[PDB]
Amino acid sequence: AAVILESIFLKRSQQKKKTSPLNFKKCLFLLTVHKLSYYEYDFERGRRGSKKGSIDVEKITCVETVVPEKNPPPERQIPRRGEMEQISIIERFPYPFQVVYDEGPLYVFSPTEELRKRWIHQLKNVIRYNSDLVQKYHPCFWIDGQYLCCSQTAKNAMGCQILE
Ligand SMILES: [Mg+2]
Ligand SMILES: [Zn+2]
């Protein structure tokens, strides 16, 4: 299928336990009408590496922004307001979004506001006719065994905030 979008993002690793330290890894993300997939990026050869994951688009229930971390490390700090900077676009990833599906949320960090907007728009387009789209979501991260937004301790808990 034709690639709609291809980007390098920071993906948050699946937090195994409420005590497991959070890991963030750079991945190459591809979107088609059928799948959202992510790979290791082979920087030396300038191409995608091994596949790390794949989400069938029909399984996605929600795609929205996430409230950013309160005290992020410099790699994820939102810059002040004010052409593409080659280094910052592959080193700094301040803008998170979430992809909710059967196997909970996937958290992805974009280097720019515009790129995050592009992905959210295209994902909303490809999921438009899905059968299990939710009318509610969690605006905050699932962190250390609970949602920051509502303190619910189940990853599959119904969203606490109605989508406008
Ligand atoms: Mg290429
Ligand atoms: Zn919540």
XYZ file of all heavy atoms in Angstrom, residues 29-113:
708
model
N 8.512 5.564 11.653
C 7.077 5.270 11.591
C 6.562 5.415 10.178
O 6.916 6.371 9.480
C 6.264 6.204 12.500
C 6.264 5.787 13.944
C 7.370 6.043 14.765
C 5.142 5.184 14.501
C 7.379 5.621 16.093
C 5.150 4.773 15.839
C 6.267 5.008 16.616
N 5.759 4.427 9.745
C 5.113 4.471 8.423
C 3.633 4.345 8.601
O 3.183 3.560 9.434
C 5.585 3.300 7.535
C 7.024 3.290 7.058
C 7.279 2.060 6.213
C 7.351 4.485 6.219
N 2.877 5.099 7.814
C 1.417 4.994 7.833
C 0.918 4.673 6.423
O 1.326 5.317 5.455
C 0.737 6.308 8.301
C -0.823 6.304 8.347
C -1.358 5.250 9.366
C -1.337 7.675 8.646
N 0.048 3.664 6.327
C -0.687 3.325 5.092
C -2.178 3.282 5.508
O -2.506 3.376 6.695
C -0.229 1.986 4.460
O -0.757 0.918 5.237
C 1.297 1.876 4.335
N -3.091 3.084 4.531
C -4.503 2.946 4.907
C -4.778 1.670 5.735
O -5.790 1.574 6.420
C -5.457 3.018 3.682
C -5.426 4.404 3.052
C -5.143 1.920 2.655
N -3.846 0.703 5.707
C -4.042 -0.573 6.389
C -3.306 -0.699 7.710
O -3.802 -1.355 8.624
C -3.624 -1.733 5.460
C -4.262 -1.690 4.094
N -5.627 -1.823 3.931
C -3.695 -1.533 2.875
C -5.848 -1.734 2.629
N -4.717 -1.564 1.951
N -2.119 -0.064 7.826
C -1.309 -0.273 9.010
C -0.513 0.953 9.418
O -0.029 1.704 8.570
C -0.279 -1.411 8.736
C -0.809 -2.818 8.958
C -0.012 -3.858 8.194
C -0.385 -5.269 8.588
N -1.808 -5.597 8.288
N -0.265 1.037 10.710
C 0.673 1.990 11.294
C 1.810 1.088 11.755
O 1.591 0.266 12.647
C 0.041 2.725 12.481
C 0.993 3.563 13.375
C 1.645 4.686 12.577
C 0.237 4.116 14.583
N 2.992 1.220 11.162
C 4.117 0.374 11.571
C 5.341 1.176 11.968
O 5.470 2.343 11.591
C 4.473 -0.635 10.492
O 4.620 -0.017 9.230
N 6.201 0.571 12.773
C 7.409 1.255 13.257
C 8.588 0.324 13.245
O 8.439 -0.872 13.461
C 7.209 1.956 14.597
C 6.504 1.119 15.649
C 7.223 0.469 16.646
C 5.112 1.033 15.682
C 6.580 -0.289 17.623
C 4.459 0.261 16.644
C 5.197 -0.366 17.634
O 4.546 -1.120 18.587
N 9.735 0.868 12.872
C 10.963 0.138 12.637
C 12.150 0.787 13.303
O 12.145 1.974 13.569
C 11.248 0.151 11.117
C 10.109 -0.304 10.236
C 9.043 0.543 9.949
C 10.091 -1.586 9.692
C 7.971 0.112 9.169
C 9.016 -2.035 8.933
C 7.972 -1.171 8.645
O 6.902 -1.602 7.909
N 13.225 0.020 13.470
C 14.496 0.609 13.874
C 14.925 1.404 12.618
O 14.519 1.073 11.503
C 15.528 -0.502 14.120
C 15.419 -1.071 15.522
C 16.174 -2.368 15.673
O 17.367 -2.394 15.297
O 15.547 -3.380 16.067
N 15.646 2.503 12.783
C 16.088 3.254 11.607
C 17.578 2.939 11.414
O 18.345 3.057 12.375
C 15.867 4.755 11.823
C 16.260 5.566 10.612
C 15.547 5.467 9.420
C 17.380 6.394 10.639
C 15.906 6.210 8.293
C 17.761 7.130 9.521
C 17.016 7.046 8.357
O 17.428 7.770 7.277
N 17.979 2.537 10.202
C 19.383 2.217 9.931
C 19.986 3.514 9.401
O 19.853 3.830 8.221
C 19.454 1.062 8.898
C 20.826 0.695 8.368
O 21.820 1.386 8.726
O 20.909 -0.269 7.594
N 20.525 4.320 10.307
C 21.061 5.638 9.978
C 22.217 5.579 8.967
O 22.283 6.413 8.074
C 21.473 6.366 11.255
C 22.209 7.662 11.013
C 21.514 8.840 10.751
C 23.605 7.702 11.021
C 22.202 10.029 10.476
C 24.284 8.890 10.723
C 23.574 10.042 10.490
N 23.126 4.618 9.141
C 24.299 4.481 8.258
C 23.914 4.281 6.807
O 24.407 5.016 5.951
C 25.247 3.378 8.741
C 26.000 3.772 10.007
C 26.899 4.997 9.915
O 27.630 5.145 8.909
O 26.874 5.810 10.864
N 22.957 3.374 6.551
C 22.467 3.104 5.205
C 21.359 4.060 4.775
O 21.008 4.076 3.598
C 22.030 1.639 5.066
C 23.207 0.656 5.119
C 22.809 -0.773 4.799
N 23.456 -1.712 5.716
C 22.813 -2.637 6.420
N 21.497 -2.779 6.300
N 23.479 -3.432 7.247
N 20.841 4.865 5.707
C 19.781 5.833 5.439
C 18.506 5.164 4.975
O 17.979 5.503 3.910
N 18.035 4.170 5.739
C 16.827 3.416 5.387
C 16.225 2.753 6.612
O 16.891 2.660 7.627
C 17.137 2.351 4.315
C 17.995 1.200 4.833
C 18.295 0.156 3.767
N 19.333 0.598 2.833
C 20.232 -0.208 2.274
N 20.249 -1.503 2.568
N 21.134 0.279 1.433
N 14.992 2.224 6.499
C 14.397 1.524 7.624
C 15.113 0.207 7.909
O 15.631 -0.437 6.998
C 12.868 1.351 7.504
C 12.399 0.622 6.283
C 10.946 0.221 6.447
N 10.510 -0.612 5.328
C 10.011 -0.145 4.192
N 9.830 1.159 4.027
N 9.651 -0.980 3.228
N 15.198 -0.121 9.185
C 15.799 -1.345 9.680
C 14.727 -2.372 9.964
O 13.704 -2.405 9.271
N 14.940 -3.178 11.006
C 14.026 -4.236 11.426
C 12.708 -3.670 11.946
O 12.704 -2.676 12.669
C 14.658 -5.067 12.541
O 15.906 -5.603 12.131
N 11.605 -4.344 11.641
C 10.293 -3.949 12.163
C 10.276 -4.161 13.666
O 10.814 -5.164 14.158
C 9.198 -4.783 11.502
C 7.780 -4.312 11.821
C 6.729 -5.264 11.252
C 6.258 -4.867 9.872
N 5.399 -5.925 9.274
N 9.687 -3.222 14.403
C 9.561 -3.288 15.853
C 8.084 -3.535 16.237
O 7.815 -4.149 17.267
C 10.037 -1.993 16.528
C 11.534 -1.780 16.457
C 11.803 -0.391 16.919
C 12.737 -0.340 18.094
N 13.714 0.774 17.941
N 7.150 -3.057 15.421
C 5.729 -3.185 15.730
C 4.830 -2.786 14.577
O 5.273 -2.199 13.587
N 3.565 -3.143 14.693
C 2.568 -2.860 13.642
C 1.210 -2.876 14.281
O 0.913 -3.779 15.059
C 2.601 -3.905 12.531
O 1.904 -3.460 11.379
N 0.402 -1.867 13.976
C -0.952 -1.732 14.473
C -1.879 -1.726 13.254
O -1.761 -0.863 12.362
C -1.184 -0.481 15.353
C -0.206 -0.410 16.565
C -2.642 -0.390 15.803
C -0.111 0.994 17.153
N -2.823 -2.683 13.210
C -3.806 -2.677 12.131
C -4.698 -1.453 12.357
O -5.220 -1.235 13.457
C -4.657 -3.970 12.126
C -3.882 -5.220 11.756
O -2.900 -5.108 10.969
O -4.239 -6.313 12.267
N -4.799 -0.618 11.327
C -5.568 0.622 11.382
C -7.008 0.395 11.846
O -7.522 1.192 12.634
C -5.467 1.377 10.042
C -6.562 2.418 9.905
C -4.084 2.031 9.888
N -7.618 -0.722 11.442
C -9.002 -1.033 11.843
C -9.196 -1.198 13.367
O -10.325 -1.116 13.850
C -9.526 -2.267 11.077
C -8.836 -3.570 11.476
C -8.992 -4.775 10.564
O -9.868 -4.754 9.668
O -8.233 -5.753 10.756
N -8.094 -1.427 14.110
C -8.080 -1.623 15.556
C -7.957 -0.342 16.348
O -8.074 -0.367 17.573
C -6.942 -2.593 15.968
C -7.090 -4.038 15.423
C -6.896 -5.070 16.488
C -5.750 -6.030 16.251
N -4.525 -5.526 16.924
N -7.599 0.760 15.665
C -7.397 2.026 16.361
C -8.721 2.597 16.778
O -9.645 2.641 15.965
C -6.522 3.006 15.511
C -5.115 2.384 15.247
C -6.441 4.375 16.166
C -4.243 3.120 14.167
N -8.813 3.019 18.031
C -10.070 3.574 18.544
C -10.021 5.067 18.773
O -11.069 5.711 18.902
C -10.442 2.866 19.876
O -9.428 3.132 20.843
C -10.620 1.376 19.731
N -8.795 5.639 18.873
C -8.644 7.029 19.215
C -7.235 7.479 18.815
O -6.279 6.695 18.956
C -8.821 7.158 20.725
S -8.685 8.830 21.342
N -7.114 8.752 18.366
C -5.813 9.393 18.091
C -5.971 10.839 18.490
O -6.786 11.549 17.901
C -5.281 9.258 16.643
C -3.889 9.921 16.483
C -5.231 7.821 16.185
N -5.191 11.299 19.446
C -5.256 12.671 19.953
C -3.896 13.095 20.489
O -3.016 12.247 20.637
C -6.244 12.782 21.142
C -7.716 12.500 20.852
C -8.447 13.265 19.751
O -8.117 14.447 19.490
O -9.392 12.676 19.173
N -3.750 14.369 20.862
C -2.536 14.839 21.530
C -2.564 14.301 22.973
O -3.568 13.702 23.392
C -2.402 16.358 21.535
O -3.529 16.891 22.254
C -2.421 16.955 20.146
N -1.433 14.420 23.671
C -1.307 14.053 25.105
C -0.772 15.309 25.762
O 0.091 15.989 25.187
C -0.297 12.883 25.395
C -0.360 12.452 26.869
C -0.525 11.691 24.510
N -1.204 15.578 26.999
C -0.649 16.677 27.778
C 0.856 16.320 27.990
O 1.190 15.202 28.392
C -1.405 16.847 29.130
C -0.667 17.799 30.069
C -2.839 17.319 28.891
N 1.754 17.248 27.683
C 3.189 16.929 27.801
C 3.622 16.677 29.237
O 2.925 17.058 30.203
C 3.897 18.134 27.153
C 2.892 19.187 27.024
C 1.520 18.590 27.123
N 4.804 16.065 29.372
C 5.411 15.786 30.683
C 5.651 17.135 31.360
O 5.966 18.126 30.707
C 6.781 15.102 30.465
C 6.709 13.735 29.823
C 8.068 13.378 29.250
O 8.460 13.988 28.222
O 8.775 12.541 29.868
N 5.484 17.165 32.677
C 5.665 18.403 33.441
C 7.111 18.874 33.481
O 7.361 20.064 33.387
C 5.131 18.184 34.877
C 3.620 18.379 34.998
C 3.177 18.381 36.472
C 1.704 18.682 36.656
N 1.393 20.125 36.467
N 8.078 17.946 33.623
C 9.494 18.309 33.725
C 10.333 17.408 32.788
O 11.161 16.601 33.247
C 9.983 18.145 35.204
C 9.116 18.804 36.249
O 8.327 18.161 36.971
N 9.180 20.116 36.264
N 10.166 17.554 31.452
C 10.903 16.681 30.541
C 12.401 16.936 30.511
O 12.830 18.058 30.759
C 10.274 17.022 29.171
C 9.761 18.406 29.297
C 9.281 18.493 30.724
N 13.217 15.933 30.097
C 14.649 16.174 29.880
C 14.818 17.116 28.681
O 13.849 17.269 27.898
C 15.190 14.776 29.576
C 14.058 14.066 28.975
C 12.848 14.558 29.705
N 16.000 17.685 28.463
C 16.175 18.625 27.329
C 15.737 18.115 25.952
O 15.135 18.903 25.211
C 17.671 18.943 27.361
C 18.044 18.773 28.819
C 17.217 17.639 29.314
N 15.922 16.804 25.671
C 15.543 16.112 24.409
C 14.039 16.255 24.133
O 13.631 16.097 22.971
C 15.936 14.604 24.508
C 15.015 13.557 23.884
C 15.367 12.093 24.076
O 16.126 11.562 23.231
O 14.764 11.451 24.970
N 13.221 16.535 25.166
C 11.773 16.632 24.979
C 11.203 17.968 25.443
O 9.992 18.071 25.653
C 11.060 15.437 25.636
C 11.462 14.092 25.049
C 10.594 12.919 25.470
N 10.537 12.677 26.916
C 11.441 11.977 27.606
N 12.517 11.486 27.002
N 11.266 11.755 28.901
N 12.061 19.004 25.596
C 11.597 20.317 26.016
C 11.056 21.117 24.840
O 11.688 21.170 23.758
C 12.688 21.088 26.771
C 12.888 20.495 28.179
C 14.048 21.083 28.925
O 14.589 22.117 28.536
N 14.434 20.446 30.031
N 9.877 21.705 25.064
C 9.195 22.551 24.083
C 9.974 23.878 23.921
O 10.215 24.596 24.902
C 7.715 22.766 24.498
C 6.952 21.424 24.510
C 7.039 23.785 23.545
C 5.583 21.430 25.294
N 10.391 24.228 22.702
C 11.153 25.475 22.527
C 10.259 26.725 22.531
O 9.028 26.622 22.497
C 11.783 25.294 21.140
C 10.796 24.492 20.405
C 10.221 23.521 21.423
N 10.884 27.904 22.553
C 10.155 29.173 22.446
C 9.629 29.291 21.003
O 10.089 28.565 20.115
C 11.074 30.377 22.772
C 12.219 30.565 21.759
C 12.683 32.001 21.664
N 14.101 32.082 21.318
C 14.972 32.881 21.926
N 14.574 33.688 22.907
N 16.248 32.876 21.567
N 8.662 30.190 20.778
C 8.106 30.433 19.449
C 9.193 31.096 18.580
O 9.969 31.912 19.078
C 6.858 31.328 19.560
C 6.002 31.363 18.301
C 4.894 30.327 18.310
N 4.130 30.361 17.063
C 2.979 31.006 16.903
N 2.428 31.660 17.918
N 2.360 30.990 15.729
N 9.257 30.693 17.314
C 10.224 31.197 16.341
C 11.107 30.110 15.765
O 10.789 29.527 14.728
N 12.873 27.702 8.319
C 13.490 26.555 7.653
C 13.947 25.456 8.640
O 14.440 25.750 9.738
C 14.627 26.975 6.698
C 15.903 27.500 7.349
C 15.870 28.888 7.968
O 14.993 29.701 7.593
O 16.751 29.169 8.814
N 13.757 24.189 8.229
C 14.063 22.988 9.001
C 15.504 22.909 9.492
O 16.443 22.998 8.684
C 13.733 21.735 8.185
C 14.006 20.456 8.933
S 13.286 19.017 8.141
C 11.498 19.499 8.086
N 15.667 22.714 10.807
C 16.997 22.558 11.384
C 17.274 21.091 11.440
O 16.557 20.294 12.056
C 17.174 23.273 12.716
C 18.633 23.649 12.959
C 19.524 22.501 13.392
O 19.236 21.916 14.460
O 20.456 22.136 12.633
N 18.300 20.727 10.730
C 18.615 19.349 10.469
C 18.842 18.539 11.750
O 18.397 17.402 11.848
C 19.851 19.266 9.552
C 20.204 17.843 9.192
C 21.623 17.754 8.645
O 22.549 18.391 9.181
N 21.844 16.862 7.667
N 19.571 19.114 12.706
C 19.923 18.375 13.916
C 18.741 18.295 14.886
O 18.398 17.181 15.331
C 21.155 19.045 14.581
C 22.393 19.056 13.610
C 21.519 18.333 15.887
C 22.820 17.681 13.143
N 18.073 19.443 15.117
C 16.960 19.464 16.051
C 15.821 18.550 15.604
O 15.210 17.908 16.454
C 16.480 20.890 16.298
O 15.917 21.489 15.143
N 15.587 18.416 14.285
C 14.481 17.579 13.798
C 14.714 16.080 14.019
O 13.740 15.325 13.937
C 14.110 17.953 12.337
C 12.611 17.635 12.036
C 15.051 17.299 11.334
C 11.884 18.764 11.547
N 15.964 15.602 14.339
C 16.184 14.204 14.694
C 16.713 14.038 16.129
O 16.961 12.905 16.532
C 17.066 13.472 13.683
C 18.490 14.089 13.633
C 16.347 13.418 12.305
C 19.511 13.131 12.997
N 16.869 15.136 16.888
C 17.358 15.059 18.265
C 16.337 15.492 19.297
O 16.457 15.074 20.455
C 18.626 15.903 18.441
C 19.810 15.278 17.749
C 21.178 15.809 18.138
O 21.269 16.790 18.916
O 22.162 15.284 17.573
N 15.407 16.424 18.948
C 14.477 16.968 19.936
C 13.071 16.565 19.561
O 12.613 16.850 18.439
C 14.579 18.487 19.987
C 15.982 18.991 20.399
C 16.022 19.356 21.871
N 17.245 20.075 22.245
C 17.343 20.890 23.293
N 16.293 21.114 24.071
N 18.488 21.504 23.559
N 12.344 15.990 20.516
C 11.005 15.428 20.255
C 9.993 15.881 21.331
O 9.617 15.101 22.220
C 11.095 13.902 20.217
C 12.001 13.428 19.116
C 13.347 13.236 19.341
C 11.491 13.121 17.870
C 14.174 12.778 18.325
C 12.312 12.675 16.837
C 13.659 12.508 17.073
N 9.547 17.167 21.244
C 8.761 17.715 22.362
C 7.265 17.507 22.309
O 6.609 17.833 23.295
C 9.055 19.221 22.292
C 10.186 19.403 21.264
C 10.009 18.236 20.339
N 6.712 17.019 21.196
C 5.272 17.058 21.016
C 4.620 15.694 20.992
O 4.591 15.044 19.934
C 4.956 17.866 19.749
C 5.571 19.245 19.773
C 6.769 19.508 19.115
C 5.013 20.266 20.542
C 7.328 20.790 19.120
C 5.591 21.532 20.592
C 6.733 21.794 19.858
O 7.325 23.034 19.896
N 4.010 15.237 22.098
C 3.509 13.862 22.115
C 2.085 13.738 21.618
O 1.290 14.675 21.705
C 3.501 13.507 23.608
C 3.344 14.817 24.323
C 4.040 15.831 23.459
N 1.794 12.560 21.091
C 0.434 12.145 20.740
C 0.222 10.702 21.114
O 1.180 9.998 21.421
C 0.052 12.456 19.301
C 0.793 11.749 18.203
C 0.219 10.675 17.530
C 2.030 12.224 17.761
C 0.859 10.078 16.432
C 2.680 11.625 16.679
C 2.092 10.559 16.010
N -1.026 10.289 21.186
C -1.370 8.919 21.573
C -2.217 8.243 20.509
O -3.105 8.872 19.901
C -2.154 8.921 22.917
C -3.428 9.778 22.887
C -4.082 9.800 24.259
O -4.358 8.757 24.833
N -4.222 10.975 24.825
N -1.959 6.946 20.301
C -2.704 6.065 19.414
C -3.291 4.996 20.304
O -2.537 4.217 20.883
C -1.838 5.503 18.263
C -2.627 4.541 17.374
C -1.250 6.650 17.416
N -4.622 4.995 20.486
C -5.296 4.050 21.382
C -5.849 2.931 20.547
O -6.461 3.155 19.516
C -6.400 4.757 22.183
C -7.023 3.811 23.225
C -5.902 6.046 22.842
N -5.586 1.708 20.980
C -6.085 0.512 20.323
C -6.356 -0.548 21.379
O -6.261 -0.225 22.559
C -5.148 0.040 19.196
C -3.738 -0.326 19.623
C -3.261 -1.626 19.478
C -2.839 0.651 20.053
C -1.946 -1.961 19.824
C -1.532 0.328 20.409
C -1.090 -0.978 20.290
O 0.190 -1.303 20.642
N -6.722 -1.781 20.970
C -7.044 -2.888 21.884
C -5.970 -3.104 22.957
O -6.303 -3.164 24.151
C -7.364 -4.178 21.105
C -6.240 -4.742 20.247
O -5.728 -4.011 19.373
O -5.698 -5.787 20.616
N -4.689 -3.085 22.552
C -3.549 -3.255 23.450
C -3.015 -1.908 23.984
O -1.823 -1.604 23.837
C -2.459 -4.113 22.787
C -2.926 -5.528 22.456
C -1.989 -6.374 21.602
O -0.757 -6.171 21.683
O -2.492 -7.201 20.808
N -3.951 -1.120 24.557
C -3.778 0.171 25.228
C -3.212 1.318 24.408
O -3.218 1.244 23.175
N -2.725 2.422 25.037
C -2.169 3.518 24.210
C -0.704 3.348 23.809
O 0.123 2.842 24.570
C -2.359 4.753 25.087
C -2.324 4.235 26.508
C -2.716 2.771 26.481
N -0.387 3.808 22.605
C 0.970 3.927 22.109
C 1.296 5.414 22.189
O 0.520 6.213 21.644
C 1.062 3.422 20.668
C 2.327 3.826 19.919
C 3.512 3.103 20.479
C 2.190 3.587 18.443
N 2.420 5.804 22.839
C 2.797 7.221 22.964
C 3.961 7.534 22.054
O 4.979 6.844 22.107
C 3.159 7.577 24.404
C 1.975 7.424 25.340
C 1.988 6.477 26.357
C 0.848 8.248 25.219
C 0.917 6.358 27.248
C -0.228 8.135 26.100
C -0.185 7.189 27.116
O -1.230 7.088 28.017
N 3.775 8.528 21.171
C 4.739 8.897 20.123
C 5.064 10.375 20.282
O 4.161 11.194 20.483
C 4.035 8.624 18.746
C 4.978 8.923 17.592
C 3.508 7.188 18.639
N 6.348 10.740 20.118
C 6.773 12.141 20.308
C 7.332 12.668 18.992
O 8.254 12.085 18.415
C 7.869 12.241 21.393
C 7.356 11.961 22.783
C 7.058 10.658 23.177
C 7.274 12.978 23.725
C 6.550 10.402 24.457
C 6.806 12.712 25.024
C 6.467 11.431 25.373
N 6.728 13.741 18.523
C 7.115 14.397 17.276
C 8.112 15.519 17.538
O 8.048 16.241 18.557
C 5.864 15.037 16.678
O 6.185 15.773 15.512
N 9.027 15.761 16.597
C 9.970 16.884 16.742
C 9.318 18.243 16.533
O 9.904 19.262 16.938
C 11.023 16.613 15.627
C 10.187 15.913 14.516
C 9.274 14.999 15.354
N 8.147 18.301 15.845
C 7.493 19.582 15.606
C 5.965 19.508 15.795
O 5.360 18.431 15.673
C 7.756 20.155 14.190
O 7.102 19.324 13.261
C 9.243 20.286 13.839
N 5.346 20.670 16.065
C 3.893 20.841 16.173
C 3.256 20.472 14.849
O 2.300 19.702 14.835
C 3.542 22.304 16.508
C 3.602 22.610 17.983
C 2.930 23.930 18.303
O 1.696 23.931 18.509
O 3.626 24.971 18.291
